[PDB]
Amino acid sequence: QRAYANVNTSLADAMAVNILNVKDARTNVFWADDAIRIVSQPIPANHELFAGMK
Amino acid sequence: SPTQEGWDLTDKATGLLELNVAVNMGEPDNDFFQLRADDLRDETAYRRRIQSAA
Numbered sequence A: 001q002r003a004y005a006n007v008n009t010s011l012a013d014a015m016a017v018n019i020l021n022v023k024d025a026r027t028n029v030f031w032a033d034d035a036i037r038i039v040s041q042p043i044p045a046n047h048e049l050f051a052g053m054k
Numbered sequence B: 001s002p003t004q005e006g007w008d009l010t011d012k013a014t015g016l017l018e019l020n021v022a023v024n025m026g027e028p029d030n031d032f033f034q035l036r037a038d039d040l041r042d043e044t045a046y047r048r049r050i051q052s053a054a
Helices: B044-053
Strands: none
């Protein structure tokens, strides 16, 4: 499990959490192209159950 | 058919009578069933319900 570490230490009951957004601002967004994925699925309304609608 | 025995049968002629019986059909024996468009991406439950209903 320690092979998966991503921070040098752990939270310790006193550490102040600092907010980073202190002013309204439109966001520039960057990413690696394999991060956002759009999963899609069919609505099988072409079935014979939905007869009477085209 | 009735039957009478003898030679002279004046005014002894018989009529014709034929009875009948009545037949009918009852109520239909249904099986209702409702699904949304989600439950027809697999169709196996739908087919099995059809066969079991028959």
